Structures are given as structure tokens and as C-alpha cells.
Amino acid sequence: SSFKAADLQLEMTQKPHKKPGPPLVFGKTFTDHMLMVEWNDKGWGQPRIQPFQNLTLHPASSSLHYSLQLFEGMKAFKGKDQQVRLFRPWLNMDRMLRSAMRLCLPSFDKLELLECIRRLIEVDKDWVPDAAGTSLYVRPVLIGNEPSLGVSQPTRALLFVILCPVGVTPVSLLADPAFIRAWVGGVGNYKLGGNYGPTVLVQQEALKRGCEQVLWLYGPDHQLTEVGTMNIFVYWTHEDGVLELVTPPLNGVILPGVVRQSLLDMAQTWGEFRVVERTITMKQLLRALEEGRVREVFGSGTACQVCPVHRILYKDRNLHIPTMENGPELILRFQKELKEIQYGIRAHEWMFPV
Amino acid sequence: SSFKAADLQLEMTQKPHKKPGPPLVFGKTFTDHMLMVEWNDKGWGQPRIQPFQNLTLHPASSSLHYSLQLFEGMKAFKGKDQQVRLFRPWLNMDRMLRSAMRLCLPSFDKLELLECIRRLIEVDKDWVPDAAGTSLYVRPVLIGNEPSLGVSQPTRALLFVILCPVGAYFSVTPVSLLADPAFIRAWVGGVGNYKLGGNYGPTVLVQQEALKRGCEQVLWLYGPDHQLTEVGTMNIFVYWTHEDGVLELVTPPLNGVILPGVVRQSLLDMAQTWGEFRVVERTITMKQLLRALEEGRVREVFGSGTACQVCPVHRILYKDRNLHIPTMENGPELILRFQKELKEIQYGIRAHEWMFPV
Ligand SMILES: *Cc1c(COP(=O)(O)O)cnc(C)c1O
Ligand SMILES: *Cc1c(COP(=O)(O)O)cnc(C)c1O
Ligand SMILES: O=C(Nc1cncnc1)c1ccccc1
Ligand SMILES: O=C(Nc1cncnc1)c1ccccc1
Ligand SMILES: [Cl-]
Ligand SMILES: [Cl-]
Ligand SMILES: [Cl-]
Ligand SMILES: [Cl-]
């Protein structure tokens, strides 16, 4: 069974928050409403769009003791004509259902959640900014909610969604093999709360070491997996002399990002250079930097879309990454095309109109 | 700058709950009171004892989004003298603090929290069952509580403690295990050695697989050489005559994928005090166990943990093939001896510095 949009009950807020005035730090400002659906031994209850409010949770909730939690993250963009659109939300929904199944949280209908989310965005339509490079960030969440200290499949869960309005520059990265984000056979390929908490300290260590984000290396040959909460891409002339865009394969330690998949799809479609999913090693990068074969290194994710990398501190070796002196041509093309699609400049099967 | 037990605020339930009748499934029944301490940028607030009540969380709470959550688990036992005691609670406090640092959560005084726990258990004295095999389980938690989607060191946090009466866990019955290398609990350089909630959520599906394959628990293998690391939520001990023909008790070393259990340390301490056989921390592979089994050198295999104290193992399903473990054939003398000494100590029959009186 599943909750249905047609059963939605609306409680409009009686106490609207002041909208942001002319400074937007990410993830602190929320809209007036939220979506709220509960699961229990009777199945999924009816979905509510209701005033943004606190959650009331039993102290034994499995969400708090055994990290029976997962999230999603996606943006809604408002175009010139004030039409609002979600970017490839179906893939976020596919990925939310996989997380849930990995955590034995209750299954749900992807299209019904989407419609509920759309309905929720429509209620908070005026929170969606329209200045350049601004968007509305959508945070669905599903948590187990059994009041039991037993490590087990819960018979109760909570699915809710909240929204935040959100308001080119290259970043530096610490690449230390000591630090591990995910392992083959682990759950790094799902968007689960537990994958993030442990990175806080590591991120602090990268700041202390004068870097801005973490380059997560994995395995004996130090594979480049991800950058911060982003997938990583390298544009270079490979060893076989062919020009390629490369990014690591989905072999268990990589989060299957929506932006990532989009960049692959675009480049693939262009048909101008080779586009592969393959392991990338610090050894390959060093050698390609020594031989001037690297053009652009960047990260991708809903946060920035495309984020260039100028520097990588590999232990004590400070590597200059020449992304910016090579345009950054590919990056700029990706941003340009993504902007066109996202803000309705160009009609595309990737946008879902609210 | 920690909270303080002198500042503790007491607020007694208006109407209490009727204690269970001597039917108790673990973790579904709680006592009348709980402890709560709030932290923010003005540091720790005053701790409080309050009637068991629900948490009020901002929906962006970092505890719920990025798994800023850690817990502990320790038992209190009521002796004949109706006096209740905590088993080595300082090791749990040490571990709770290390977990807190790992998750960038706020530091606190181990003795102050321990004193507040004393008071909480004191207040709920009567919930502590004295029937044989029973105890009060104590569950401290520390969760982040920043109301922002930024992945970061929170500026707010919540520390609470709830209590469960527990029935006799078992007589002692062995368990069968699923040993499948595809499922990996923790990795070197990871956080499997901290009691973080994020280590437990992904084990549900695996545990469910073990049941469909006819096992009761998971034997967590690690490496290409299939090391026996842990059993369910228990550390693993093997009693055998080793390759060199020397009788020993072995348990994997704390190389980072092992949770340093309090019973584990205690079994080690106890066994070395007896000084009657070799006690060592060494890696254990399925290759070594197989051969030991074919040669009749394995006497007992068991788990250790607060839940069980000591849990016999009698079967391992490895590579579709069932491995019989003669634990029960061999007494289990070691297990039985361990169980007895802990019991005597835990219920104050023998006086011991491991016990902290409530
Ligand atoms: C969210 C996330 C990504 C990329 O996600 P998108 O769907 O592209 O926004 C990549 N890696 C990690 C670790 C993430 O949490
Ligand atoms: C809690 C726990 C143990 C044992 O801990 P005790 O301190 O002995 O109760 C062992 N392994 C795992 C994975 C645990 O969570
Ligand atoms: O996208 C994220 N953060 C973000 C969004 N918009 C601007 N800056 C940062 C994110 C990703 C993964 C986990 C948590 C947050
Ligand atoms: O001690 C635990 N569970 C338990 C306790 N008493 C009886 N049965 C089971 C435990 C340990 C670690 C993580 C979660 C729970
Ligand atoms: Cl349990
Ligand atoms: Cl995947
Ligand atoms: Cl962030
Ligand atoms: Cl350790």
C-alpha cells in the first residue's frame, strides 16, 4: 500500500514567517509549510501539508538510536515567467526508495510522493526565489519510529519533507588515505544519515589543513571516489591519448548522484569526446598532471551543480589542478546548459513543472 | 565545562506506571523517569530528572539528517540486599565520551553523568527487578540538534537517559550464525569501534537475511581472509587448543573494526587473573577455525555483550555449508564459569571494585 495525493489534507499556516530580506546561508531558512506522512501497523496514513512545526518523538525512536534514517535532496527552479520546476525528481524518488529498502523502512509510491511534494511546493510558491543562481532546496526524509530499543525492522515510520530557499569559484581539497567515507559492501551508495555524521570531524581536519573540502580516497591504489558531498569528475587526455571525461563507476562506494548522471547523459549526447565510468587513482592523476594531460577536475551535486577544483593536498604534496587555466571550458558548458534547462529557457523532459 | 549533578533538577511523575508481572520482551517497556540535559552555545544547561516523556525536535535536527547520534548500554543489578549496582559503568562513560568526540558532539564529565545516572536509577529503584537473571538496562544517548541542513558540528545537542527493566535473557542456549562475507559491518579507518547509531541501522536487513537462511544471528566477517570480528552485537571469543598445541582463549584485537565491549574486557581480565591458560588478542580467520574444528581443537565459541553476558554458538552457516561448533559438548565449562563469576560479582555475592553501588 501507499499514501495517495488525492487523500491530502491541507492545514494552512496561521503564522507566516517573514521571507528572507535583501543573506541566505544554506539550510537555515525554512518555508511556512511541510509535508507529513506516517506509517504504522495500519499502513500509510493520509499525507498532510501543514505548518512547519516540530516533531514529537518517543525517546526510544529507532531513528535516534539506530540511525534508521535517510534523506533526499533536490532543487526547484523558478524561470523568468514565474513557473517553478523540479530537476529530474523521479531519480531522487528512485534513490529514496532504494535507501528505504536498504533500511527496511516502508515502501511508498514514487509518483504519489512526487505529487505530494509538488503540492507542497505549490503551497509555498512565493518562497521560491528567482534571482540568478537561486533555487528552492527540497529535503524529503524517512525515518523509523518504533519506540523500542530492539535493533529491528520498525512497525512505524515517518516521512516528512521541508523546504529552504537558497541563494564559478574553485575549491581546495585534502586527500588523505587515512579517511574513509564508504566501503565495498557498506552503504555508501545510499543517502543515509549514518554516512554523513562521521565526515564532520574529517571536514574539520581539512579546514585545519587549509583545504576547503575532503577528497575521499579508497583502497590500496588510492582511488578518487567523491569530493565532499559531491561526485568527482576529471576531464583530461587519458593515457591511451584519447580525450575523455571520466568519473568513478557505481561499484558500491559511490553515491549515484542526479547531477552526475546528468553530466554523463549530456556529454554522451554531445558525442565529442569519450565519456567513461572508471576508477581514477592518485597515480593516474599525478602522472597526468606531470604530463600536462589534465584540463579540468570538478565535483558535481545538487549543491553547486558543477564545482571546480584548483588544488589537492595529497598528504604533504600540494598539487595544482589547472581547471581554471583551461577555461574552465567543460564546466562552463555544463553550467550554461544546466541553467538553460533548469530555468525554463529551453523546454526539456528533465524538468517537472510545479 | 560540563553539566553538574549538584544542579540536578527533580520533577516526579504525577501518576506512575504499574511495573511488569513476573512476559518481558527487551526494549518495549520503560520506567517512570528519564534524564535530560540540553547543550547549546551557552554550554551545558542543568541536567534534569523528569517523567518519561517525548522529545520535541526541530525537523531539520542534525540527529535525524546526518546521524549525529550515539548511545551506550549497561546494566544495573539488584542484589539480595535489595541494593542495586552498576557493572563497570566507567568503561561505558569512557566509551561514550570517545564516541562524542568522533561525532564532533559536546564533551562532558564522565563522573557527573555517572552521578546523574545514579540519581535516575535511585529515583526508579523499584523498577529494578530482583528475579533471577534480571536487570535494569540503562540507555544513555547523545544526539546533535542543530536546526540546519548544513553538515557540521552542531551548536545544540541533547543528552538523555532512559531505563528498561529486562527479564532473564535465557539455563544457557546456543545460537546459530550466518557467516557471509558479502555483508560488512565496519572497515579499518571507519567508525565500527564507536557505539554510533549509524553502525546499527544497516544491520537490520542483514539480520533479516540470516533468519530467512535459518540462522539466529550474524557472524561478521572482515577481509579477504575472512576474519571473525563480531557476532550480532556481541564481541567474539574462541576457546581452543591453538596451532602450537597451547590451550588459549582468543578474541580479535581492537584494530578498529571491533567495538571494545565491557564484557569482552572483563572476560579477558578475569581469564588472565585465573592465570590457568593463555589469553591473547589475535586475529581469527575462518581458515583457522575450520582446521581447528576438523582436528577437534575447538572447545567453545561464544559471544560477549551486555545483553547476554556470554552467548554460546553451536553452528555456523559458511558457504552454504553448516559448521557444527561443539561448544555445548565441551560443557560449556568456560562459558559456565564465566557466567557464574559475573553473576556472583554482579549481584554482590562477591564484593568487587567493578561494581558501582546505586
Ligand atoms: C547528495 C550526494 C551526492 C550527489 O547528489 P546529487 O543527487 O547529484 O545532488 C554525491 N555524493 C554524496 C556523498 C551525497 O551525499
Ligand atoms: C554494544 C556492542 C558490543 C558489546 O558491548 P558491551 O559493552 O560488552 O555491552 C559488541 N559489539 C557491538 C557491535 C556492540 O554494539
Ligand atoms: O546539497 C547539499 N548542501 C547544499 C545545498 N545547497 C547549497 N549548499 C549546500 C547537501 C548535500 C548532501 C548532504 C547535505 C547537504
Ligand atoms: O544490549 C543490547 N540489546 C539487548 C539487551 N538486552 C537483551 N536483548 C538485547 C544492544 C546492544 C547493542 C546495540 C543494541 C542493543
Ligand atoms: Cl537488540
Ligand atoms: Cl548504486
Ligand atoms: Cl552542507
Ligand atoms: Cl578501540
UniProtKB/Swiss-Prot annotation, chain A:
Reported cofactor(s): pyridoxal 5'-phosphate
A GO CC term attached to the entry: mitochondrial matrix
GO biological process: branched-chain amino acid biosynthetic process; cellular response to leukemia inhibitory factor; isoleucine catabolic process; L-leucine biosynthetic process; L-valine biosynthetic process; lipid metabolic process; regulation of hormone levels
Keyword tags: Acetylation, Amino-acid biosynthesis, Aminotransferase, Branched-chain amino acid biosynthesis, Disease variant, Lipid metabolism, Mitochondrion, Pyridoxal phosphate, Transferase, Transit peptide
Enzyme class: transferase
Residues holding substrate: Y137
Positions bearing N6-acetyllysine: K283
Catalysed reactions, as listed in the record: L-leucine + 2-oxoglutarate = 4-methyl-2-oxopentanoate + L-glutamate; L-isoleucine + 2-oxoglutarate = (S)-3-methyl-2-oxopentanoate + L-glutamate; L-valine + 2-oxoglutarate = 3-methyl-2-oxobutanoate + L-glutamate
Domain of life, per lineage: Eukaryota
Stored Pfam families: Aminotran_4 (PF01063)
Keyword field contains Repeat: no
Enzyme nomenclature, EC number: 2.6.1.42
Effect of substituting R139Q: In HVLI; reduced catalytic activity
Tissues where the protein occurs: Ubiquitous.
Modified residues annotated as N6-(pyridoxal phosphate)lysine in this record: K191
Annotated GO MF terms: branched-chain-amino-acid transaminase activity; L-isoleucine-2-oxoglutarate transaminase activity; L-leucine-2-oxoglutarate transaminase activity; L-valine-2-oxoglutarate transaminase activity
Subcellular location: Mitochondrion
The UniProt record lists the keyword Oxidoreductase: no
SUPFAM superfamilies xref list: D-aminoacid aminotransferase-like PLP-dependent enzymes (SSF56752)
Disease: Hypervalinemia and hyperleucine-isoleucinemia: An autosomal recessive metabolic disorder characterized by highly elevated plasma concentrations of valine and leucine/isoleucine. Affected individuals suffer from headache and mild memory impairment.
NCBIfam families, per database record: ilvE_II (TIGR01123), PRK13357.1 (NF009897)
Chain's role: Catalyzes the first reaction in the catabolism of the essential branched chain amino acids leucine, isoleucine, and valine. May also function as a transporter of branched chain alpha-keto acids.
Family: Belongs to the class-IV pyridoxal-phosphate-dependent aminotransferase family.
Complex and partners: Homodimer.
Protein name: Branched-chain-amino-acid aminotransferase, mitochondrial
